[PDB]
Design a protein around this ligand. Structure first.
Ligand SMILES: COc1cc(Br)ccc1CC(=O)O
Ligand SMILES: [Zn+2]
Length: 138
């Protein structure tokens, strides 16, 4: 689990969105596994506006922050999962790293702030759903 709080926005994994994220839906993209919902409180996270391909992500299944090289946001295939069918995820950044069910929502961050969150895992790979293109969060 885990979420981004910038301005009046909560960003989550779509597949982990609560009944309240949907009651207050701002934007969802099934293909990217993202949902943004509205908040009452203001958020203190900076969103990274950069083309960084190195940063740190938190891995709840190790209670550890891992530094990673990750791919440019792309249209990369994700297989089964109890949450989705066989489908290409867009704005997806893979890195070599540990990602289990429950590691989704873990924040990847560079010097410029939040690059995105964990959305995919397996095969020794960790998919982060990118949020740097979502300028409207600022
Ligand atoms: C990174 O999370 C996963 C890793 C694997 Br392998 C399968 C499914 C998920 C999604 C989840 O359970 O949130
Ligand atoms: Zn950066």
């Amino acid at each position: 689990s885990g979420a981004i709080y910038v301005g009046n926005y909560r960003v989550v994994n779509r597949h982990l969105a609560t009944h309240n994220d949907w009651a207050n839906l701002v934007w969802e993209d099934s293909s990217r596994d993202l949902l943004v919902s509205s908040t009452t409180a203001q958020g203190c996270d900076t969103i990274a506006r950069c083309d960084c391909q190195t940063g740190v992500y938190y891995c709840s299944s190790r209670r550890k922050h891992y530094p990673v090289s990750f791919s440019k946001p792309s249209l990369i295939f994700v297989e089964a999962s109890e949450y989705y069918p066989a489908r290409y995820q867009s704005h997806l950044m893979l890195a070599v790293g540990h990602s289990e069910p429950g590691d989704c929502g873990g924040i990847l961050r560079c010097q410029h702030g939040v690059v995105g969150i964990v959305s995919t895992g397996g095969n020794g790979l960790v998919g982060f759903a990118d949020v740097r293109d979502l300028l409207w969060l600022d």
